[model samples]
Target chain A: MLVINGTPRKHGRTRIAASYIAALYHTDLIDLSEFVLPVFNGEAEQSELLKVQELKQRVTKADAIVLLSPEYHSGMSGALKNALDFLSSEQFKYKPVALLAVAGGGKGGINALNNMRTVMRGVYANVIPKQLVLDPVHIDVENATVAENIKESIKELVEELSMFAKAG
Target chain B: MLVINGTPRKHGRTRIAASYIAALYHTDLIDLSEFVLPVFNGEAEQSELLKVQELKQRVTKADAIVLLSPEYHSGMSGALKNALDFLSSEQFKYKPVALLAVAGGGKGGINALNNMRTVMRGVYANVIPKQLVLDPVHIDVENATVAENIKESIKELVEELSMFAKAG
Candidate 1:
């Protein structure tokens, strides 16, 4: 399993969620902040970039995937979306995937999750409906910690992912 | 008016639509293909890039906006969304905006337009309800020319945009 954290902030709440989920699966996390991803223009040169190739390889190797992002403009982060644009159904097809969104505040982030589901479906990922939306209220000041209920929810989501992943 | 062509294809159908619309208003087009925008990370360094600055300027000065994209995975291209991430309501606040999506085939692309509308709304762009989705049948082999009916549809969309734009 692999967790792909789509937040541009090195220590954003989304990454905190990603960390928690990755640890549940005993896997590593791909933090977009560490990557200097060029905007995906579908150019051969852009596709050939080291980080771009690395991202593809990472996703391809992972048996299951977790995509975590901070809600930006009522949607997933563009940084994460740009990374996804570099890929297609080729890497994601039939892969069991989970989604998590960190909302800034108040009853937001559902739209972000739905938007992600739309794109993940476009890539043919077996996106599990079991998802999570994390709000600021669920995080510590530094966003290094999450609420107990959220962790339990993620645990259930991870279990759901494992069920689908076991088939592959 | 400013036309932002979100497709990375320099000569993609989306750009053709942007060109036609821009010509209708005798305005300039912001082609993402020509810009080397780094993935937006909300970092000072990334935001300070010349192209990023220029893009913000162009958008802020435009009296109205037209956003064009090719549907990618039932959504707007990530490149366009990444560009938009750099902007907020500051540049788009109540700015009259129009949307167009070029579908690869069939009755696709409406989702892409809707996705764009959602994000544009988040940015506080007064996106006109009148939108367009152009398919391959509407374009020539080179995607340089659009069908007559498509042009008529676009004319009405542009007129709607104009009406909203005149108020701002």
Candidate 2:
């Protein structure tokens, strides 16, 4: 399994949620901030399509993948959307993916998750129906540990991920 | 009248279409790139919200407002969407707004325009029904002039804007 962290704030709530998931799966965590992808300009030369290709290569090698994202404007981050745009039909052609979102509001990034489902469906990725959402403004994250309720949700997400990974 | 340019590439095809509209209406153009607004984080900060409030001020003050947006993933540009998030119900209430899109393929940013319609409706803005779209990859812009067909479309858009502004 591999975890992809897509939040811009380093050591923020999103990273904390990703850490919990990575610990549960005993998987490697890849920080999206490390990848210096240019803004999506639609033009082939200006976009980070090539970098997305490289990232997709890594994802294809993993048994399962997790997307850790932050909500922006009732949707997923632009950088994450741009990266997903780089994926071709063959790359995510039936891979199992999980969503883990860390947001500051009561809704907990539900809008971002919905938009991700729409975009992932476009690429033919099999996203697990169950998602883990951490409402950071309300939930306490102390010493890298989330609230009990959110930790239980993460556990559920890991179980679903395992089910998908073992399925045909 | 006012034109809002939403293309990432400065001085690109969208600007050309917007320029023609501005020339016809004799309206000032506001390129979104010029604003250094922070990415929308869902939390409406008073300071950042003030910037959008200022934009609303422009919209209210203008005789007509024209939007020049590029299509991205069958949706509006993230920057434009973020900018739109800054307005309130009263600010855009009954204001006449026009849409002009520049795309590289079919559908001609119609999906983006539809999204805008939904968003503007939320703020009670009167959006002009007749939208103008230019497919840059197909429509050639040579020596600071668009093709004759595109020019005709711009004239129609100007007429529609005039009628909408009058009606509002």
Candidate 3:
């Protein structure tokens, strides 16, 4: 599993939720903010940018990927979209993607997930039907017991990703 | 009404469709490409640009808005999203928006519209349910007869925008 933490806060709710699920599988994480990118200006010089190559290669190596985004403007962050624009469909081919989202904390994050579905498909990834939408307060919970309740959804997402990755 | 012509190519299918609809009732157009934009640089230095304020003002003044996007990576064009980042809920409050999309010229554009719906909601726009998703082939045809077939859909879209904009 390759988890792309798609929020600006490197250690915020999105990363926390991503870590919980990533720990359960063979996963590596990348914070989208760690990379310096412009809106993918297509020039021959762009291909020389090692970070872009590295990002694409990482996606290709992963059997499955997890996209964890905090809802920005009712959808996934543009930072994530900018990162995705750097790659081609070939990298995501035959890979399965799992979605986890955090919205206004109280409201559900279905819209972000829906928007993500379209993005992942464009990259030629197989998206597992199962997903996780964490509410704001619950997303920030530090209590172990309260946090453990989230495991059921992660486990389901993990299992779902495994199934799709295998089939892909 | 302000028409956001979101496609990068001013002469592309998206603009053509948007042009036809803008031909209806009072409408002014903004071709996003003509304006220079950075990737929403958050620093105060980034805020010095006059174009951003101008863009927002246009949306604010409009009784309703039309968003025309060319499908890119299975979603709305990033160019469109970047332009939208300049505006906020204040500009779209209680305003009607009609979506017009052109994809690989197929049924695939429904996903883009779905994605755009979330984007629009972030700005608190009351999106009119009636929309125009133009097929790529027909979108390229400039003939008046083919255009006439398009009227029925646009008529509904125009009507929907009128009903909601009046209420707003």
Candidate 4:
């Protein structure tokens, strides 16, 4: 399995949530920040405009993929969106993928998750029905551990991933 | 006026279309890239999220706002969607906005732009009825100038912006 971290903040909220999932699934955490994707220019040659070659290769090799993102303005980040734009249909088709959204306030990134679902469906990914959300920000990560409640939510996400990955 | 560049490509197709509008209107181009915001992690500390502050300020200060984005999987870029998610009722209420989409392959971006109109209307922005779309990515951009056809389309858009910006 692969865990995709979509937040621009290095080691920020979504990363924390993803870390919890990574522990459970024993998955490699892929930071989207490393990919210097140009904005979607709509050119075929520019399709791999960013560092999507490596990320897409990882997606191809992984049995399951997890996307962790923060909700921006009630939706997913532009960088994340740009990253996904680089993906061709072959890479995403029927892939077992899960979504986790981290938000700083009340909505808990639900909007971002919903928006992701809408876009991912277009690519024909087997987006796992179950999703996880973390909200209200985690300030204390001194020892690289998240809060209890956040971990619990991610645990549920891992269980869902296990089921989906096995089915695939 | 604020020109919101929503294309995932920093210097790609949408920029070509947006430059046309920017030149006609002498508007400041606010590349959504500069914000580099995290996904919305639903926290209520409005002041803490600087991206939110910048987005709110941009929309609030603009007499009119133009959105330039490439369509992805029949929807707007996740980043653009997420960025727009930062608006609260107070900031979005009765704001005047326009949209232009550039896509390489099909009409998906146009559909996405229409979908955005619904969301923008729900959020209380007076979405200008006229929208522009550019497809077939192979186009020329000379010194920030677009093809004559694209320029004509932008002129129509400029007329629409004028009407909407001056509307009571």
Candidate 5:
């Protein structure tokens, strides 16, 4: 299993939720905070510049992927999108994946989740229809102590993903 | 105006067509062969790492943009998408934009064009419905000498973009 937290804050709200999911799954976690990926050049010859050969290797063998993102400008973070560009559909082809989005309480995660599904569908990932959206804006969600309302959604998300991951 | 050629070969089929479009509008060209952009983190704090302040500056004031791409694995090149990820919708909001695609001629360019439109629309660019697709898979298009069949499409593309650019 591979879980990704696509936010600059390694310990920010997004990661807090991501850590909860990662720990539950007992999976490898990749925090975008530490990665300084170069722009993808379309050509495969420039692969060495990105140092993510190991990540793709994991992608090749991984059964499930959990993408946890903090909505930025009403969309997924470019840091996450850039890393995604480094890969082709081959990496996630027909794989089961789950999406979780975090955002300020002012707006919900609908936009990011919608756009992400579009991009991910293009890569042919069989994303489980049920997704998690947690709006813990301005509030501390440390130690997975999220709002009571959000805890149920994440529980359902984990349940759905667990079933989907085993199906493949 | 800005015209981008998203191919490693600056003088290959894609750029030859890009150069033709650039000549028609007298626009500055950005060939990915010359640009090495760092990944975007959805934050201006990392803008210095991109080193393309001039490019973004130009994008801010440009009336129309011509994106020339070569289809790879049924999608637009990651290099071009990576660069697009760096800029937000504010950069091209309501600005006219055009798309040009080059493919291996075996298959049509519907996928690249469609996917690109999705990304472009997210940036709030006004994408003209008509596009130019050049299939020079086996032919040499080094001198912009494409088949006569495609000349009219390119001509119409230029006319449509010009009208849209000025309408704003």
Candidate 6:
């Protein structure tokens, strides 16, 4: 399993949710902050960029994937989308994928998840219907914890994802 | 006015459409291919990126703007969105903006333009109702020219944009 942290912040709100889900899945998180990804311009030769190569390889190897991002400007972070641009259907085709988003504040986060689903579908990812949205009120960013009320739901999400991964 | 060439491909197909509109308005095209924009991660101090600063400044100064991109995975290229992400309402608020997309092939490009509009609205851009989509069949990428069929429409589009820019 693989968890992709789509936020670029060192300790972004999305990472708190990412950690909990990753822990339950016993998976490694690909923290985008750790890599310097050049903006994907379609014509750039990504072979020379070691980070891009590593990202593609890791994603291709994952049995299933979880993507987490902080809602920005009513959509997923450009950082994550840029990373996805480097990849093709080869990396995502038929792969069981789950999505989650952390709302910066207010009643937001659905747009980011919906935006992600649309683009992920373009790559032919087997995006499961089950998705989780972590509103700002439900996450304690400073302490890096998800409120207790949502922990059970997240665990159930993890279970469903495992089933999809194993079955697919 | 400014025309943003959202694709990273040098002399990309989208540029054919972008050039037509830019020439009609006598505006400069800010080609993404010419700049090395790091992916926008929200926390990165953009002041260090000279290209990003220039991009923001040019956008802020523009009374009106035209954004062009190729449909990638059912959305605007991440390259353009990343550049937009670097900017905020300070540059786009109430600014008259026009949108155009070049279809790679087949009957596509609407999704890219629609995606751009949604995000641009988030920055409060006064996106005009008028949009143009140049299909690959109508563009000769080898010679960098748009076909005769769309020339008149593009000119009309230019006139509308000029009127909007002047009025706003």
* The best candidate in terms of DockQ: 1
lDDT of 2 by residue, B5-31 (tens): 776556567767666667766787776
The true-versus-predicted C-alpha distance at residue B73 of model 5, in Å, is 6.7
lDDT of 4 by residue, B1-168 (tens): 888877645566666666666777798777765555655434567446776787788778887888777778766876676566667556767877787777775646765676577557646777888887777543465555566656677777867886877875
* Model 5 TM: 0.79
Candidate 1 residue lDDT tens string, A19-138: 777775689689887865877666788789888889899999999988888888878888888788889899999888998889987888988998899999888998997888888888
Report per-candidate DockQ: 0.68, 0.21, 0.29, 0.29, 0.25, 0.67
How far is B117's C-alpha from truth in model 2 (Å)?
5.6
Q: Rate the local accuracy (lDDT) of all candidates.
A: 0.83, 0.67, 0.73, 0.70, 0.72, 0.82
Per-residue lDDT for B26-108 in model 1, tens only? 98788888875877767888788888889889999988887899898888887888888888889999899999899998878
lDDT (tens digit, per residue) of candidate 5 on A94-145: 8888888888866567766765676677678878999877777433565544
Docking class of 1: medium
Q: How far out, in Å, is residue B71 in model 1?
A: 0.9
Query: Where does the lowest 10-residue lDDT sum fall in candidate 4 chain A?
Result: A33-42
Tens-place lDDT per residue, model 2, A14-126, is 76777667776689777665664544445655544566556767777777788878765455665465555455456666888888676777754776676666556556778
Fnat for every candidate? 0.63, 0.06, 0.29, 0.36, 0.19, 0.62
Instruction: Give candidate 2 regions above 4 Å deviation.
Output: A42-56, A59-63, A85-90, A142-144, A165-168, B10-15, B30-65, B78-111, B114-138, B141-168
| Candidate 6 TM-score to native | 0.93
Q: Which of the numbered candidates is closest to the native, going by highest lDDT?
A: 1
State how far residue B21 of model 4 sits from its true place (Å).
3.0
Order the numbered candidates by lDDT, best leading: 1, 6, 3, 5, 4, 2
Count backbone overlaps in model 3: 2
lDDT of 4 by residue, A77-122 (tens): 7557767876756888888888878787675567778767777887
Backbone Cα, N, C clashes tallied per candidate: 0, 0, 2, 27, 0, 0
- Per-residue CA lDDT of candidate 3, range A24-112, in tens? 66588876655556555445566668788888888888888888887777777766776776776889875788888877665658878
